[PDB]
């Protein structure tokens, strides 16, 4: 308990920085909750750091490739490939924006088609699952309400029954 | 207190905190509220989450630039493949053939020039592959008049190809649009990216709703058995203490 | 205050319940159609899963 | 299981569905009948003594 | 502290309806289970909703059928293109042997 | 686990044991008490005739 306590205090000091640690009730339960939270935060912070560093690397690599392709196209097709008509540019932007929206690896149909299908399938699947859960919540709520009514009716009937028994006991 | 719990449970969805915990421990609840801003919705530190969002934006910008070029590159490759297939089927016009040969040659020279130019640093001393310089490849380009002609024709062909690709994207997402005219299809294409983003946003909202409903269901499943047990306890009392004992004695007397 | 909460709470609760029940009585008559639609929905979901 | 236990105990204690029954209905009926017959016997006795 | 005449009448009606009046403790328990959020009265999936669902699923079915057909076209087209690309590989392979 | 612990604390007597006790008691009343009462009713009728 003494080790978990030390970990929590160190973790709280890290989170609150230069601000005095607020006084809180130190009991077995508050310590367990704080401990789970501290473990969770530490594990997530580690994961997020690794993801952030990787994204930086990927940003550099994508930039390098973009330059490469731009240079390749300029040398091969001339500067004129960048002088598309207003509508041409609009079409290009829409393809680009659609691909970014679906987080695709490339602009090929082999990537676009499965992505659109997955998006549509996931949306339907979740909507059905939400309907089913809503029915279950309503059903359980009804069961719970009936049970609560029953509980109150039983309390009343039991009190009446106890009074009646006492009255009869006096008669006996 | 109920508000504090809702707030903490929404932000710290992993914490199993009951109302009894916050009632017995008021100062602890204050600590959790203060911790909530310091902890992102996913349990990570707020600073690190901010850094992550910034780094994601940067990547998205770079990716947008790369994709622009990538779309053109792929279209050109697809165009070349289509023209090649038509050339083998004997259906290509002499002008198309010249265009195809000229464009293929321009791209190839460019690709190979780059293979040679390891953008490396002039080292005045670096041995080229096969001893070839960029100039050796430029000599294999078609005549300058044909290159300019190919580049002018490519612009019109590229716009047509971009249009065809957009229509295909649209036709797959909204197959009902195939029965519509080119003008209406072009209007719908201009909204396609936004429609797809909306659908993605809808999915995210429905997932959040799902998580909320799930949390409520779990609460109800926790309360319901206890209520049944209280009812059972009352009935047991009526049966054991009143019917088998109190009333049975009365009936006998 | 206590009496007001009790009164309002019960009203609220049963209102919510009744609202839930009243919706049901109309529902018994419509049950055969509901079974048919549920059967149809199951059949369509199975077809959609195959597709 | 809890729901089944509750339903079984309740059915036993509420045979007519609306009232908690502590005495066996068959027995309750006999007590009433016996009380009525004793009241008649007491009248006849009083009448004869009178 | 004020209970309007309407709520009082409604509550009296509730008392008269023979429904058990839930005590404060019971109300607290049940109301907890109540998300403020307007969870729209589960409009009990009005036959209409099921009908709407059947319509929605039929629309989805039609959509999947159209998309499957399109995919089959794209797949046939790609298969043909892949065969022809193999022929190109053979032609380019001959040209490469000429250069050697 | 909380619900199981609550069931064990509240289980003296076992619901099944209690239902059995209730059923036995019911049978005992029909076999012994009900006939006794019928006999007494009959005896009272005879005493009336004696009157």
Curated annotation (Swiss-Prot), chain E:
<feature type="coiled-coil region">
    <location>
        <begin position="41"/>
        <end position="73"/>
    </location>
</feature>
<comment type="function">
    <text>Contributes to mitotic spindle assembly, maintenance of centrosome integrity and completion of cytokinesis as part of the HAUS augmin-like complex.</text>
</comment>
<comment type="subunit">
    <text>Component of the HAUS augmin-like complex. The complex interacts with the gamma-tubulin ring complex and this interaction is required for spindle assembly.</text>
</comment>
<protein>
    <recommendedName>
        <fullName>HAUS augmin-like complex subunit 3</fullName>
    </recommendedName>
</protein>
<comment type="similarity">
    <text>Belongs to the HAUS3 family.</text>
</comment>
């Amino acid at each position: 308990m003494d080790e978990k306590s030390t970990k929590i205090i160190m973790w709280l000091k890290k989170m609150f920085g230069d601000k005095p640690l607020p006084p809180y009730e130190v009991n077995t339960r508050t310590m367990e909750i704080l401990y789970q939270l501290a473990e969770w935060n530490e594990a997530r912070d580690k994961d997020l750091s690794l993801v952030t560093e990787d994204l930086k690397l990927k940003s550099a690599e994508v930039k390098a490739e973009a330059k490469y392709l731009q240079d390749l196209l300029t040398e091969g097709l001339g500067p004129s490939y960048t002088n598309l008509s207003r509508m041409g540019n609009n079409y290009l932007n829409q393809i680009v924006d659609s691909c970014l929206a679906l987080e695709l690896k490339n602009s090929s149909l082999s990537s676009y088609i499965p992505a659109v299908n997955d998006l549509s399938s996931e949306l339907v699947a979740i909507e059905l699952n939400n309907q089913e859960m809503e029915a279950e919540l309503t059903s359980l709520r009804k069961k719970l309400t009936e049970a609560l009514v029953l509980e109150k009716s039983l309390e009343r009937d039991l009190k009446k029954a106890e009074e009646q028994c006492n009255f009869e006991k006096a008669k006996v | 207190m109920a508000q504090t719990l809702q707030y903490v449970s929404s932000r710290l969805s992993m914490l199993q905190i009951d109302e009894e915990d916050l009632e017995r421990n008021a100062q602890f609840g204050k600590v959790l509220i203060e911790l909530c801003p310091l902890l992102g919705p996913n349990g990570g530190s707020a600073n690190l989450n901010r850094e992550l969002e910034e780094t994601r934006r940067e990547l998205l910008l770079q990716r947008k630039m790369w994709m622009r070029s990538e779309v053109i590159y792929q279209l050109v490759q697809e165009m070349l493949l289509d023209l090649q297939v038509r050339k083998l089927e004997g259906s290509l016009t002499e002008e198309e053939r010249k265009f195809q040969d000229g464009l293929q040659q321009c791209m190839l020279v460019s690709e190979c020039s780059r293979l040679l130019t390891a953008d490396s640093v002039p080292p005045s001393d670096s041995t080229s592959i096969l001893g070839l310089d960029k100039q050796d490849l430029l000599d294999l380009l078609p005549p300058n008049m044909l290159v300019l002609w190919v580049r002018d024709r490519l612009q019109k062909q590229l716009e047509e190809a971009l249009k065809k690709k957009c229509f295909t994207f649209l036709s797959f997402h909204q197959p009902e649009t195939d029965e519509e005219g080119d003008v209406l299809r072009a209007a719908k294409v201009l909204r396609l990216a936004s429609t797809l983003e909306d659908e993605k946003r809808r999915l995210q909202n429905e997932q959040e709703k799902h998580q909320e409903m799930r949390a409520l269901l779990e609460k109800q499943q926790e309360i319901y058995p206890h209520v049944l047990l209280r009812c059972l306890s009352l009935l047991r009392q009526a049966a054991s203490e009143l019917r088998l004992r109190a009333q049975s004695d009365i009936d006998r007397i | 205050h206590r009496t007001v909460r009790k009164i309002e709470g019960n009203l609220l609760w049963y209102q919510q319940l009744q609202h839930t029940e009243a919706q049901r009585t109309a529902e018994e008559e419509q049950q055969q159609r509901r079974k048919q639609l549920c059967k149809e929905i199951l059949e369509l979901r199975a077809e959609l899963h195959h597709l | 299981k809890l729901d089944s236990h509750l339903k079984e105990l309740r059915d036993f204690m509420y045979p007519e569905g609306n009232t908690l029954m502590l005495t066996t209905p068959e027995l309750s009926g006999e007590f009433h009948q016996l009380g009525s017959q004793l009241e008649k016997l007491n009248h006849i006795t009083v009448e004869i003594l009178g | 502290n004020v209970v309007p005449d309407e709520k009082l009448q409604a509550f009296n009606t509730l008392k008269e309806s023979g429904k058990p009046v839930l005590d404060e403790k019971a109300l607290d328990e049940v109301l907890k289970t109540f998300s403020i959020s307007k969870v729209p009265a589960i409009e009990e999936v009005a036959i209409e909703k099921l009908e709407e669902e059947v319509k929605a699923l039929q629309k989805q079915k039609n959509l999947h059928i159209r998309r499957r057909n399109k995919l089959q076209m794209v797949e046939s087209g790609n298969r043909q293109m892949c065969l022809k690309s193999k022929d190109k590989e053979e032609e380019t392979g001959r040209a490469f042997q000429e250069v050697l | 686990s909380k619900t199981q612990r609550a069931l064990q604390k509240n289980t003296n007597p076992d619901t099944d044991a209690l239902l059995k006790s209730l059923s036995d008691h019911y049978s005992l009343e029909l076999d012994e008490m009900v006939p006794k009462m019928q006999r007494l009713i009959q005896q009272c009728e005879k005493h009336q005739e004696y009157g």
